Amino acid sequence: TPSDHLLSTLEELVPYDFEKFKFKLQNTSVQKEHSRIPRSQIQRARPVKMATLLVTYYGEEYAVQLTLQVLRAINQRLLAEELHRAAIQL
């Protein structure tokens, strides 16, 4: 599932880089007519937890786009590309 690819993607994501990931996620624009993840939850959310959260709050397709963009925001173009490639496989 998309959440499984997001899990693995953010699992490979270095925790020290995830620190910035979740900081950029807090500053990520909310998708049209979709539910916002509380910043208090984002700070405490695990790399593997956000995979589920983004899907629940925004959606599967939106979770991939959100994570991809935030990865690029933190100079993780590798994971962003691999996530895109995962979306292609899906």
Task: Transcribe 14-72 into DSSP letters.
Answer: -HHHHHHHHHHHTTSPPPTT-PPPPHHHHHH--TTTHHHHHHHHT-HHHHHHHHHHHHH
Distance CA 61, CA 47 (A): 18
CATH code, 29: 1.10.533.10
Q: How was this structure determined?
A: NMR
Structural domain range at position 14:
1-90
Distance CA 39, CA 1 (A): 25
Residue type (1 letter), 68: L
Q: Over the range 22-60, which residues count as b (16 or more CB within 10 Å of their CB) and which as e? A: beebeebeebeeeeebeeeebeebebbebbbbbbebbbb
Number of domains the chain contains: 1
